[PDB]
Design a binder for this molecule. Structure first.
Ligand SMILES: *Cc1cc2c(cc1C)nc1c(=O)[nH]c(=O)nc-1n2C[C@H](O)[C@H](O)[C@H](O)COP(=O)(O)OP(=O)(O)OC[C@H]1O[C@@H](n2cnc3c(N)ncnc32)[C@H](O)[C@@H]1O
Ligand SMILES: *Cc1cc2c(cc1C)nc1c(=O)[nH]c(=O)nc-1n2C[C@H](O)[C@H](O)[C@H](O)COP(=O)(O)OP(=O)(O)OC[C@H]1O[C@@H](n2cnc3c(N)ncnc32)[C@H](O)[C@@H]1O
Lengths: 525, 525
């Protein structure tokens, strides 16, 4: 069965494809089953096929994006914009609504438009990856550093548009975004902030401009197709030092988090975004499950102890990085050792003190925390055959008790559905993103189904407990949006009203973040 | 003539007033000319009467705000929400559209809902002033400090809603805003972020929630009436030190800014928001114009030399504050002395070194920069009889040539229209808010029209040079918004569409930020 936009005939679709090829050129429109396989979710969730694209269109310019959008409006064809389309764990490039055309802006709009050394920023097209920006900065001998997520192959822009995160002091990517250019759902182009002022040099200097401040509305959003974005870049410090603290017990989570808060809330002595990773996360980065346990079920405790002993890691492993002149690093490290050294069984290691296998994660963090992009974390996906993951990502207060409750709630469903729970707390000033990655064999229909059902349960149970997700998978966007329903779904109704006003024909990424335009509401898509 | 809402009769307005009284109480609805005098712009702009309220309603609660909004929809009555209505320099409490009813939320919705010591936040109603919050923190022996603008009588909430600024490291108020509750234009209530998740404790912990991030759309905005807002609060550091650098020559501006940028962009050694104030700003804070000059026209060079010599101040005066352990402060201050000391004629003073009349501004800044609110700056308005100001507030790159260009441009016109130009550059990481206060005799219709005409010319002339304003007066909002016209006025068209979608009846603060709903567009008020 050929994949078709909803309500659009074989004939009408064929004509639209031709219109698209007129805009972007023949090579840059894909529509055959073989070509579209590469744009399916690499880590499919649920037994049944879902999230099927009808085509991929690769524009080279904003003008072409505007014409594509105009064509889509005429035919009623949905358009799902992506940058590099590496949102793996949340759907990959795949559209929320089957039958949508992917607009893969980053294939050809991949220019670094500006890196400004004096004011420390970049103006970027969506195709710029973190590796690309890294190469630029190195080549020019920049005094700037980037902030990258765990995997460097994504888009500086794309990641920011999903409010993704890295681990330097610039880790909150949307916080550092300054200025954007967007194609709105009927094809009009708009610049935000000081970019709305012709001839301004301040587009990447002052984010707000004048009047209502809208850039946030284009994040986790279906209100347009972004074609340019600025981002502030931090100055590279003179020196840095990373460290690991291993903690022996599952139960240490509470005290680790409680001790952490006062050292983090003022951005010193914990300067970077610390990560607190469980043994499953760290073992999966350097080893296969079968090294520790052959068995269909939850890993017994003795296999867990062997993981820890062989990798010389704790159940909970805390990684951080310090920056500045060497005497500042030594003061801050001293404080960190003193505070966390109050937990029995804690041991400390700098990035100069491990050369073993279990220390590979530390060396990888030391790269990432210094703005050096890496793909070593891809090795997690070799944990089991045909490995995929999904991200269940609740927000947590920086409170040890809350963090333990979340860990216990997630652990228990993980056990019930037979899926390993790899945990990574990403610690902001006043909150943590509690990222729960579930690694599974994507070829087994039953495992894909258990992933879906387990995660649907976790979203509901976490919400009954007062926790919501910061970000989620295509498969869960409706369920997650249904949890933010204070005042009888006030927030959703507001988003629908705006959606319907800007997108009267229901073209752009319908269903993103549970937000469906009028023509799609009330349906089972 | 009685001031009446456009298109609304005496009889209908009388009916709507009684309904307002049914909601809030007779005592809480003001509608006589005498009662309304105190809600006129205290620093009026233009010779002709403008910005006339028809009434003032003071609601006790969110529910009452909802009822008021419902009434105003049924009767076609525009509503102008304020918190404390101290937006002096930009309109005071007066509505952009004459005939609107002011909803003074802050009169009775003035509760501190929560101050959380552990996570460092406050949840506030709109009537909490900076003084009120300071008093709370002092009374409870808090380890937190607030961040305040120059005058403490404003609203933590109201100031943030106009994207106002203060001077500690938390001086970007909008950056630290975390969660809000808002009554939308037809009377529905919504909570943003994690507050949309029933029972979440993270409303003031994690700003974004899930899906498109909307809070910024309620700043400089007419999309709702805000009833609660969260803000982060910084921990008080163990020590601080403030300093003043005087620079003798107007031409020193370029070099000052160019030396400043590398000391600021990393937040160290310039940790706080420095301010660079000219002699007219500082002299006006401590003296009357007639002490220095009592002739016609702009002050002569000799008179300016006298202000400087008598006050022991420069033409340009740089104020900053340093925070932390004493050895860190000393290291940072040594670095600041070394850099700025290259400018011939620069002199340095700490808050411990000057107790004279000229040093009164340094003493005030030492309070403000440590979150101690003050009203001493109100003395600026005694510079001339019936004194008032208007703020012309262009954004500048943190570049000396740019700042110098802006200063000369503004000075040329100030001189041409015989208005004294007091300057305060407010220095962010990558930008400056170049606040130009023109102080004038508000009683004289000539002076008020010259203010109006001069500022209109400056808005145009700045925009021709590629500069736009971050914030502006009622009288200038149309003109300022007209400058942000990239892409054939795309930004404004986008705002108008959202406005019409959320506010089908055109009720909330029509004209705020140049954004008029359909029923008022093209009418010229
Ligand atoms: C499997 C995995 C994933 C992962 C990770 C570790 C592992 C093992 N670590 C991450 C980390 O440390 N931090 C983080 O933010 N994410 C992490 N992930 C998830 C994922 O790898 C990355 O976030 C990746 O960077 C995201 O993919 P990409 O950068 O390629 O972004 P995209 O797929 O193009 O876009 C994502 C969504 O944003 C909207 N979007 C994107 N571009 C546009 C344009 N131009 N216009 C409008 N909307 C756009 C779409 O919603 C798109 O789906
Ligand atoms: C004359 C002057 C002004 C001044 C200053 C020094 C002098 C001599 N120094 C300032 C500074 O250091 N920083 C700063 O941000 N502003 C400074 N000003 C300007 C003014 O004093 C202050 O900003 C003052 O804090 C603002 O007044 P207030 O705080 O009372 O705020 P408001 O008048 O109530 O509200 C302003 C606008 O915001 C919108 N608003 C307010 N509340 C609501 C609600 N609840 N819902 C919807 N919108 C709201 C309106 O647009 C309102 O007009």
């Amino acid at each position: 069965t050929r994949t078709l936009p909803p309500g659009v005939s074989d004939e009408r679709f064929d004509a639209a494809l031709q219109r698209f090829r007129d805009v972007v050129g023949d090579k840059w429109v894909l529509s055959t089953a073989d070509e579209l396989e590469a744009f399916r979710d690499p880590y499919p969730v649920g037994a049944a096929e879902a999230n099927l694209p009808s085509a991929v269109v690769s524009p080279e310019s904003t003008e072409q994006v505007q014409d594509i959008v105009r064509i889509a409006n005429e035919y009623g064809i949905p358009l799902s914009p992506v940058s590099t389309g590496k949102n793996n764990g949340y759907g990959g490039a795949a559209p929320r609504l089957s039958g949508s055309v992917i607009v893969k802006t980053g294939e050809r709009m991949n220019r670094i438009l500006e890196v400004n050394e004096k004011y420390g920023y970049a103006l970027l097209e969506p195709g710029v990856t973190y590796f690309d920006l890294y190469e630029y900065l190195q080549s020019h001998d920049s005094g700037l550093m980037l902030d990258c997520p765990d995997l460097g192959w994504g888009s500086v822009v794309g990641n920011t548009l999903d409010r993704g995160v890295g681990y330097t002091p610039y880790g909150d990517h949307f916080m550092w975004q300054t200025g954007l250019e967007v194609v709105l759902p009927q094809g009009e182009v708009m610049r935000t902030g000081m970019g709305a002022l012709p001839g301004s040099d301040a587009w990447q200097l002052f984010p707000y401009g004048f009047g209502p401040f809208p850039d946030g509305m284009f994040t986790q959003s279906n209100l347009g197709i972004v074609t340019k974005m600025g981002i502030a870049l931090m100055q590279r410090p003179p020196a840095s030092q990373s460290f690991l603290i291993t903690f022996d017990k599952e139960e240490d989570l509470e005290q680790i988090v409680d001790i952490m808060l006062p050292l983090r809330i003022n951005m010193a002595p914990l300067q970077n975004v610390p990560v607190l990773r469980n043994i499953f996360m760290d073992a999966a980065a350097v080893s296969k499950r079968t090294e520790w346990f052959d068995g269909d079920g939850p890993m017994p405790a003795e296999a867990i102890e062997r993981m820890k002993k062989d990798l010389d890691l704790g159940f909970w492993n805390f990684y951080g990085t310090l920056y500045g002149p060497p005497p500042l690093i030594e003061m801050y490290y001293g404080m960190i050792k003193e505070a966390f050294g109050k937990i029995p069984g804690a041991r400390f290691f700098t990035h100069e003190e491990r050369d073993d296998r279990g220390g590979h994660v530390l060396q990888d963090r030391h790269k990432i925390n210094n703005g050096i992009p890496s793909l070593d974390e891809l090795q997690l996906l070799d944990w089991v055959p045909n490995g995929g993951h999904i991200g269940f990502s609740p927000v947590s207060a920086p409170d040890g008790r809350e963090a333990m409750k979340q860990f216990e709630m997630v652990r228990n469903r993980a056990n019930e559905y037979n899926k390993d729970y790899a945990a990574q707390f990403i610690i902001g000033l006043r909150e943590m993103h509690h990222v729960c990655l579930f690694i599974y064999d994507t070829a087994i229909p039953e495992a894909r189904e258990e992933i879906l059902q387990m995660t649907k349960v976790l979203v509901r149970e976490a919400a009954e407990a007062g926790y919501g997700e910061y970000r989620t998978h295509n498969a869960l966007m409706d369920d997650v949006m249904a949890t933010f329903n204070w005042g009888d779904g006030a927030l959703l109704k507001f988003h629908e009203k705006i959606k319907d006003a800007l997108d009267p024909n229901g073209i752009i990424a319908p269903g993103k973040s549970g937000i469906w335009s009028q023509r799609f509401r009330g349906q089972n898509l």
